[PDB]
Amino acid sequence: GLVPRGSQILCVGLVVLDVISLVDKYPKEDSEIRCLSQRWQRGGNASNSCTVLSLLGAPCAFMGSMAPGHVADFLVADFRRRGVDVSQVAWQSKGDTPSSCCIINNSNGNRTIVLHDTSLPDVSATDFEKVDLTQFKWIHIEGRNASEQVKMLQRIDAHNTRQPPEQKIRVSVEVEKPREELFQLFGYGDVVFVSKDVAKHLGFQSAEEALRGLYGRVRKGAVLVCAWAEEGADALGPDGKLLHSDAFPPPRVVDTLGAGDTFNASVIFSLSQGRSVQEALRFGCQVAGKKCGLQGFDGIV
């Protein structure tokens, strides 16, 4: 259906079906056991952020690869259950829609993960060419297939050239896997999220070290953003002033899975509403902190 010009926030990245089984002890190879409970959840960074953005009350759309099938079906249903617009999906002829198996050992809370396979093509720069962008006021890109996504980022730059400052599509990027490839993305977007895990691999030991040490890699004018779990989150702009917000511990911690996806979407959301980096950064921490005391996303409102 009809979508008003410049109203949606689009996230581009992975969606995946996580099957999650809770067990007494970890199963010895070649045995048949029962779990205590089993959940089917929709996963993925770009995917979760959409779930959150919807709850926060923004129109939003997901772009990611799916292949027709029963996994795609459950995945699409959940998306829609969360108010997420699914019309930009790049359906594939080749490969499996991603699906991971996770086994949580109940007595010691360990997680053993069999990761979705690699068969499905990522969204391509030509997949992306075909998208009428007028729809969006903000595009956010989970870093995955970098050479391609660079072309999409350049495409968005083009578009903006011609639009007055109030009809420009804001852009953000997330680099959350320690993979040399992705590091180029640092040079794109108005907002750049770098993850504690990436920063530790590059050798930094605190969000301030990360921001101060990586700011040079970002494009001029850009805000670089780093969250450190319970240590809060920082951010650094062109003004060179290091911004910070402490965490907001919940009553008790229950589910931190997807917390960073929540921090991301919330920061994005707050900025798109015209708030300040300092304000977006705080909000980001508040929503993500609430999430951690909750199971899933339902509570977070």
Ligand X SMILES: CSc1ccccc1Nc1nc(N2CCNCC2)nc2c(NCC3CC3)ncnc12
301 is a site residue for a copy of itself (CB under 8 A): no
Annotated binding site for beta-D-fructose: 18, 44-45, 48, 261
Residues whose CB is less than 8 angstroms from the CB of residue 175 and which lie 6 or more positions away in sequence, other chains included: 143, 182, 183, 185, 186, 192, 193, 194, 195, 198
For ligand X, which is the closer residue by CB, 213 or 249? 249
Cβ–Cβ < 8 Å for 60, 11: yes
Which of ligand X, a copy of itself, none does residue 205 bind (CB under 5 to 8 Å by kind)? none
Annotated binding site: 18, 44-45, 48, 111, 229-232, 258-261
Least gap, CB of 290 to ligand X (angstroms): 8
| Structure token digits, residue 29 | 């190879």
For ligand X, which is the closer residue by CB, 243 or 288? 288
Considering only 87, 106, 112, 167, the residue that binds a copy of itself (CB under 8 A) is: 112
Where b means 16+ CB within 10 Å and e means fewer, 103-136 reads bbeeeeeeeeeeebeeebebbebebbeebebbbb
Long-range contacts of 110-117 (CB under 8 A, 24+ apart): 110/26, 112/26, 116/16
C-beta nearest to ligand X: residue: 249
Amino acid at 71: V
125 is a site residue for a copy of itself (CB under 8 A): no
Residues paired with 38 in a beta bridge: 21
252 is a site residue for a copy of itself (CB under 8 A): no
Interface residues toward ligand X, by CB under 6 A: 30, 110, 227, 229-230, 232-233, 247-249, 253, 256, 259-260, 263, 285, 288-289, 292
Instruction: Write the CA distances from 264 to 58, 84, 102, 161, 163, integer angstroms.
Output: 14, 17, 24, 26, 26
Contacts (CB under 8 A) with a copy of itself, residues 66-105? 70-71, 73-74, 96, 99, 101, 103, 105
Where does this chain bind a copy of itself (CB under 8 A)? 19, 21, 23, 26-40, 70-71, 73-74, 96, 99, 101, 103, 105, 110-119, 177
